[PDB]
Design an enzyme around this catalytic site. Structure first.
Site, PDB file in Angstrom:
ATOM      1  N   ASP A   3      -0.006  -4.326  -3.741  1.00  0.00           N
ATOM      2  CA  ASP A   3      -1.098  -3.356  -3.819  1.00  0.00           C
ATOM      3  C   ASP A   3      -0.628  -1.909  -3.551  1.00  0.00           C
ATOM      4  O   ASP A   3      -1.124  -1.229  -2.652  1.00  0.00           O
ATOM      5  CB  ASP A   3      -2.201  -3.771  -2.823  1.00  0.00           C
ATOM      6  N   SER A  34       0.875  -1.161   0.000  1.00  0.00           N
ATOM      7  CA  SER A  34       0.000   0.000   0.000  1.00  0.00           C
ATOM      8  C   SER A  34       0.907   1.203   0.000  1.00  0.00           C
ATOM      9  O   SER A  34       1.816   1.412  -0.817  1.00  0.00           O
ATOM     10  CB  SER A  34      -0.858  -0.090   1.269  1.00  0.00           C
ATOM     11  N   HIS A  89      -7.677  -5.306  -0.172  1.00  0.00           N
ATOM     12  CA  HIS A  89      -6.406  -4.673   0.204  1.00  0.00           C
ATOM     13  C   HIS A  89      -5.777  -5.337   1.441  1.00  0.00           C
ATOM     14  O   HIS A  89      -4.542  -5.515   1.514  1.00  0.00           O
ATOM     15  CB  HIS A  89      -6.694  -3.190   0.465  1.00  0.00           C
TER      16      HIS A  89
HETATM   17  P1  LIG Z   1      -2.393   1.627   2.479  1.00  0.00           P
HETATM   18  C1  LIG Z   1      -3.844   2.658   2.111  1.00  0.00           C
HETATM   19  O1  LIG Z   1      -1.186   2.510   3.058  1.00  0.00           O
HETATM   20  O2  LIG Z   1      -2.769   0.337   3.425  1.00  0.00           O
HETATM   21  C2  LIG Z   1      -3.433   0.419   4.711  1.00  0.00           C
HETATM   22  C3  LIG Z   1      -4.949   0.434   4.502  1.00  0.00           C
HETATM   23  C4  LIG Z   1      -2.993  -0.650   5.737  1.00  0.00           C
HETATM   24  C5  LIG Z   1      -3.227  -2.088   5.310  1.00  0.00           C
HETATM   25  C6  LIG Z   1      -3.704  -0.452   7.076  1.00  0.00           C
HETATM   26  C7  LIG Z   1      -1.508  -0.542   5.993  1.00  0.00           C
END
Ligand SMILES: *[P@](C)(=O)O[C@@H](C)C(C)(C)C
Length: 372
Positions: free
Chosen positions: A243, A220, A298
């Site tokens: 992702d 993420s 995710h």
């Molecule tokens: P990304 C939007 O930095 O991922 C988030 C939603 C976590 C899985 C909580 C690290």
């Protein structure tokens, strides 16, 4: 615990390393092949302040923090805490970057699986105020006493997002490079006094790293971190973005990544404005691969996918349509194949080469988002 054991032939140990002790030092959780396999006793979320940070991240209050702690405060992850490092071999090394609202301990399903296949994994805890919580020490005496200073996630105004997210990704890349430097310095005999008093003797790490075989992986925000890190630091020989959230990256990075890069995406997270940035990385002179895990969300990449039952997990978007163990196995096996290819490992991970091409009933080659 329902966090899966590693599938590989090595037993897995876990420990924490903080050096130096300050807010500018490195803090990481190490997963590594262990000499022995005596008990799977590593505590998953080691301090109550992480639960407070998670509550703040979720936009909830004090009681939710305490509820999470009641539910998960004694949960383990399947690694031998402070077990001796398995001797007699140099191990390839992965530096792992966590997402927004996470922290170093929440990707143990990935870390433990990699370590079980003969990697050392250093999961960094970022001090850019993207972690739900993290800590450091104000001086050496505070470290000796365990007198922690806590730093909690910074919430942003919409007008701040562009500038601050980019400052944060730059800090994250610096932290990944700093963590690598710490591990390589220890590998070559740098005397280091762990700011944490733990039974694992860091001297064990001397002459333990295959210094040519280094990768960066992240989820993420941590996926954007992979790209920023590769652009700045050529000691990392390839990267795997799980992702990736591409928003934080500046325009300049896209032409500055010589190393191979692998995007592993969930089916249900991705959107055109994000995918187009991934496509900007492609060029005939570079290796870029992309797969999408069918029926995944995710959270399939992080450990909270294993924290609850199927119905509650699906309702909270911690679980997808796909089985969480099946999804992490695909991500891990595809990653192992990619790592073998681009680090030149002499293992059997090439058995999963077809997964890099998305050739499985639960994989999509490329992406469902055909924005071109
Ligand atoms: P990304 C939007 O930095 O991922 C988030 C939603 C976590 C899985 C909580 C690290």
């Amino acid at each position: 615990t329902k966090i899966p054991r590693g599938n590989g032939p090595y037993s897995v140990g876990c420990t924490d390393l903080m050096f130096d002790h300050t807010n500018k030092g490195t803090f990481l959780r190490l997963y590594y092949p262990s000499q022995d396999n005596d008990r799977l006793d590593t505590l998953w979320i080691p301090n109550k302040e992480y639960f407070w940070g998670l509550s703040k991240f979720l936009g909830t209050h004090w009681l939710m923090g305490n509820i999470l702690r009641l539910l998960f405060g004694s949960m383990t992850t399947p690694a031998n805490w402070n077990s001796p490092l398995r001797p007699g071999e140099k191990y390839p090394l992965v530096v792992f970057s966590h997402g927004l609202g996470a922290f170093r301990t929440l990707y143990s399903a990935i870390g433990i699986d990699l370590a079980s296949h003969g990697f050392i994994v250093a999961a960094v805890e970022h001090r850019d105020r993207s972690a739900s919580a993290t800590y450091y020490f104000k001086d050496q005496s505070a470290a000796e006493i365990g007198d922690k200073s806590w730093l909690y996630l910074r919430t942003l105004k919409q007008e701040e997002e562009t500038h601050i997210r980019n400052e944060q990704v730059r800090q994250r890349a610096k932290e990944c490079s700093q963590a690598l430097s710490l591990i390589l310095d220890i590998d070559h005999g740098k005397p280091v006094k762990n700011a944490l008093d733990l039974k694992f003797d860091m001297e064990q790490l001397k002459d333990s790293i295959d210094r040519e075989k280094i990768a960066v992986i992240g989820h993420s925000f941590g996926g954007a971190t992979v790209i920023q890190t590769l652009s700045e630091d050529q000691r990392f020989r390839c990267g795997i973005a799980l992702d990736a959230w591409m928003f934080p990256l500046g325009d300049e990075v896209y032409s500055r990544i010589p190393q191979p890069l692998f995007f592993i995406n969930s089916e249900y997270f991705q959107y055109p404005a994000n995918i187009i940035k991934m496509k900007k990385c492609y060029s005939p002179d570079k290796e870029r691969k992309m797969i999408t895990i069918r029926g995944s969300v995710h959270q399939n990449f992080a450990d909270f996918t294993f924290a609850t039952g199927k119905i509650i997990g699906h309702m909270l978007k911690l679980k997808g349509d796909i089985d969480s163990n099946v999804a992490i196995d695909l991500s891990n096996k595809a990653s192992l194949a990619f790592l073998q290819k681009h680090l030149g490992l002499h293992k059997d991970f090439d058995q999963w080469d077809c997964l890099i091409e998305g050739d499985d009933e639960n994989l999509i080659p490329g992406t469902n988002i055909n924005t071109t």
